[PDB]
Amino acid sequence: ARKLVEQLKMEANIDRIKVSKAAADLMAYCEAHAKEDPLLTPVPASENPF
Amino acid sequence: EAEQLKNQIRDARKACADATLSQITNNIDPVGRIQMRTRRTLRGHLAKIYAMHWGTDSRLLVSASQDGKLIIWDSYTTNKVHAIPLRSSWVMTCAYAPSGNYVACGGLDNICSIYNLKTREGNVRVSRELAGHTGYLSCCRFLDDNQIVTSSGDTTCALWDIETGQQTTTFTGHTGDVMSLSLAPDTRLFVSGACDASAKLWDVREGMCRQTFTGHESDINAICFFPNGNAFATGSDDATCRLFDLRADQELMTYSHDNIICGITSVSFSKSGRLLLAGYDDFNCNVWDALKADRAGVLAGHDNRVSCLGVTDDGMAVATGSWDSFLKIWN
Amino acid sequence: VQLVESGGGLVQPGGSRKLSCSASGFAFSSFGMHWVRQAPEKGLEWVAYISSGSGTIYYADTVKGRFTISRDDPKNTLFLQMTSLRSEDTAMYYCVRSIYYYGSSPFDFWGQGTTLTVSDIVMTQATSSVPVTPGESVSISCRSSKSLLHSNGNTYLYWFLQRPGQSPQLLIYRMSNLASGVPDRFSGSGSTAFTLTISRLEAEDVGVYYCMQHLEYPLTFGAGTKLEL
Amino acid sequence: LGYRCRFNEDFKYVLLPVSYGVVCVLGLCLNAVALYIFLCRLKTWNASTTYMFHLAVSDALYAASLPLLVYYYARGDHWPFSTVLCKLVRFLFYTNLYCSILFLTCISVHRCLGVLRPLRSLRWGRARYARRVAGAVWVLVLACQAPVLYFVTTSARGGRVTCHDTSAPELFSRFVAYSSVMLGLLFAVPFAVILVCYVLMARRLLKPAYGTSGGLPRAKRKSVRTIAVVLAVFALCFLPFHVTRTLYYSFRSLDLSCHTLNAINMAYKVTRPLASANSCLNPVLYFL
Amino acid sequence: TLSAEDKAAVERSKMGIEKNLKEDGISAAKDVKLLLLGADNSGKSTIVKQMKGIVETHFTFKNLHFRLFDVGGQRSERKKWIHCFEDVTAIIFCVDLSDYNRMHESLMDFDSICNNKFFIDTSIILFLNKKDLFGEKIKKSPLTICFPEYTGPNTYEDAAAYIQAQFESKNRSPNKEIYCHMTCATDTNNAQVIFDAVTDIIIANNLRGCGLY
Ligand SMILES: Nc1ncnc2c1ncn2[C@@H]1O[C@H](COP(=O)(O)OP(=O)(O)OP(=O)(O)O)[C@@H](O)[C@H]1O
């Protein structure tokens, strides 16, 4: 049980901050790479490998 | 003391959650109906296909099936490049080395075999056989040509040096069978989902668990990293897909519907992380908007349970395997 | 890997002889096989080809009907039966292995040829003899009548270096594709005027350099470009 | 065609039109929906599904051949169309009637082999074999029913032009010989093979296992019930029709008093609707 | 196909690799896959050794290549790898008739296995071994120690029929069938019993697949 409580105590120090920014990070990653995604904006058949 | 620590962790989780992801995301338009059609169909496998993996060149893929065959396919021209016989037909996972010189597989044999693709004799031969896991092999991913991380049903995950053939590290702390693992883009951390309905983030260099996530109700069957590397998604046997965050260290989004009552076999992300693809037991594969809670499309080309799923490194295609012994590439 | 031939000798005009290739150290059945001829005028010439599993068979424009190429995979032997030998057949023939799949390197290994005595897309190598200065980088070029850049992006120009008293070595299989076991100082580029560049040239690379094409079934070698130190 | 003994046929001009029309409508609808399910609800076929598909297409073609016959019989045995049209329609009629019988024989043999030699006749690659068998059956029945294209013609009777289901009245001996040969080859062998297969397969199915408990399994009893139902339906639909046609042709070749010829005419042309109705009954029987 | 090397690659894929795939598929359809289940010291090992991670045992009896997969070495969760043995011909379940705690444990395990969703249409060959030991023990001790609701005679045949009826009571699927068998350590016709059982199962599979219902 000492190992479990020691791991739990060490797991306490994470400095979790800004859940709103934790969502805005995924927002910004999806926004900035939107044009690079071929599935999001389908490519023409001339430039499609398939 | 453990209960007090858990209560402190819960309080710290609640202290940060000022805004829910569903509220902020309402200001952008959805992706709409994602129209994706089958382009190729690989028709060489006989028994049920259990795992498949893409190569980093986004043209070659490796697939594993119950008939004891590792087949490498040319996705563009449908040609089969290699056919590797397996000693044990009960393969549950397969991997492609980032360089492209090696493939790996494992299953109920409790052995993670490694095969050499580029030899001098012109045939693919087995390079190393890694042993030490007590339970079945459920997932394996290369770090490089010499390092591979495996997960097993003995509630442990391990890191191996292929040349040495022994476990460098053993990751311990799960109480249920570990079902899947996913590597970070930098290959410095990974997440493993277990049968204890919990996901744990690991440190390959340190060798100890860093964070634990306890959102799901049943056993987690599939995990996958977000492309940015600070988030991941899970798929469990309660018709639910959930999105966690490493920094916030709690659940962020939930991907479920009332009409969905079957477990999730595989999950995968897109290049931008906007589309979350998940295979189900409805014999289908539902495309989810990651930022929202709304479904965006269905990959209904399979007549059997979809067992494996993945997206290419350039994001131009999606390959889905299933128990109907076929692989389909969707664009 | 080891390809060894035999059955070479003096042949009277109008006679017949057979060439045999002995192979070991590699999966013979998965490899397609070649026969390449070199006259004593330092010119390589392709003769016949057989595919893996004895399927597709090709013959040269000058030996068709006269020659026959056959193989048996269980015995790991490749045969070449030639009938009514002419004075133009006085040359030494090589046994070349060549496997074909996505990303493979064809023409990778060459055997030790046996001499025989009997008593398209043209490749241009205008440079014939070039003084080689050790320690100084050199450049070797080749020319083609028809562009080798195919629609699938594969430009089939091959590079072979023939050491004196030795078989050719596959330096480069497709353009800017360094082969296996070849030092990194070599480099290939081009389009159609291609070029092989050897940065920081050292010793033990003196020989005759040839350029080859794999676009069409009529397969043509280049003229002998020689580096003399 | 000035026959000595003129028959009395008033039943036919009412019975055969309505029967053929109802059978045509029902069989066309059932075979259309059967092809729809066999081509859309699934596209993975085993050695039996191909046989059912080919039987369905034979039944559909047989039903499609019917509108000309119902029109001709409802118009009082009058033919207003060309000779080649009626030759083709009779050829299609008999070709599909015997093709359905051959496909039923194939299904019976397949079931009897799946029960009597289960492991051997089941664990192999057995789809191209079914396709080859179906193609061979199609080719054989087409080559066998080709002579009716030559045989069938038209001939007027004092202002009454009619189409001959048999040959012309002058070449009747050769048609009778050919019809007897075809009756033998394409009825007696398939009927006997179907009967033997189903009887032996039911006999095997009645045998209990070793470690079984209770009575016979519900599967092994409903299978025998379906065997008996299929065999009885086939017999009722085809055996009286063929025996009546044999007696009809034999007594036409060797004449008797007018009463006997009228009676055999009545019997044969009231047994015709059963052989017609087998085609629409087949999808129901093979769906139940 | 538009290039010579592409032509040769397509020829390789369609002529060599597909040839080996077809040959492997032809040679892989001759075998019979059987799952082996039971308790510890229940005779499960001693019958598979008499005929002869995961323990794969194979033998040929009547031009049939039986493959018995002993999964008893798996200490992990059963509900995570039970779907792998979906296409098995049958399940061979071994039950020891000597003791009673393992008897009730085997009742629970048989109930769990029989009503599994992946095995609704999968027949079961149930073995009740150590019958000599069971009779020798029951000639001096009653079966009421095991089943308190047992009201029949304390004789070998009546007791054994009661246990056999107890196990078959767990079946609630009409399509499934349990092929019970009484065997001992010196019994040698077990392979024959499995042969007739799998023959019957194959007959029932043909009946199901022929559209005869
Ligand atoms: N021996 C006969 N005596 C009198 N009439 C006959 C005789 N044989 C045939 N017919 C008449 O000839 C007509 C057609 O002759 P045919 O044999 O070609 O047709 P069928 O087989 O008898 O049956 P259907 O006439 O309905 O098509 C019939 O309507 C029948 O009335």
Residue numbers in the entry:
A (entry chain D): 12 to 61
B (entry chain C): 10 to 340
C (entry chain E): 2 to 120, 125 to 196, 198 to 235
D (entry chain A): 21 to 308
E (entry chain B): 1 to 52, 66 to 226
What does the paper say about this structure?
The nucleotide-responsive P2Y receptors (P2YRs), consisting of eight members in humans, belong to δ-branch of class A rhodopsin-like G-protein coupled receptors (GPCRs). Purinergic P2Y2 receptor (P2Y2R) represents a typically extracellular ATP and UTP sensor for mediating purinergic signaling. Similar to other P2Y1R-like receptors, P2Y2R couples to the canonical Gq/11 protein, leading to the activation of subsequent intracellular Ca2+ wave propagation. In this study, we determined the cryo-electron microscopy (cryo-EM) structures of the apo P2Y2R in complex with Gq, ATP-bound P2Y2R in complex with Gq or Go, and UTP-bound P2Y4R in complex with Gq.
Notably, P2Y2R demonstrates higher potency in Go activation compared to Gq in response to ATP, as revealed by the G-protein dissociation assay. Although the receptor adopts a similar global conformation revealed by an all-atom RMSD of 0.58 Å in two P2Y2R–G-protein complexes, subtle transmembrane helix movements can be detected from MD simulations. Compared with Gq-coupled P2Y2R, the distance between TM6 and TM1 (Y2686.58–K321.31) is narrowed in Go-coupled P2Y2R, which drives ATP to move slightly toward TM4 and TM5. Compared with Gq, the α5 helix of Go undergoes a 1.1 Å rotational shift (determined by the distance shift of DH5.13) toward TM5 when aligning the receptors. The CH5.23 of Go requires a smaller space to accommodate its side chain relative to the bulky residue YH5.23 in Gq, allowing it to move toward the TM3 and ICL2. Consequently, this shift enables CH5.23 of Go to form polar contacts with H1303.49 from TM3, cooperated by the inward displacement of ICL2 and TM3. Due to a 1.1 Å rotational shift of DH5.13 toward TM5 in Go relative to Gq, DH5.13 forms a salt bridge with R2245.64 from TM5, whereas the equivalent interaction is not observed in the P2Y2R–Gq complex structure. In the cryo-EM map of the P2Y2R–Go complex structure, the density of ICL3 is well-defined, whereas the density is disordered in the P2Y2R–Gq complex structure due to its flexibility. In the P2Y2R–Go complex, the ICL3 engages tightly with the Ras domain of Go and provides a larger binding surface for it. Specifically, residues Y230ICL3, T232ICL3, and S233ICL3 engage in a series of polar interactions with HS6.04 of β6, Eh4s6.12 between β6 and Helix 4, and EH4.16 of Helix 4 in Go, respectively.
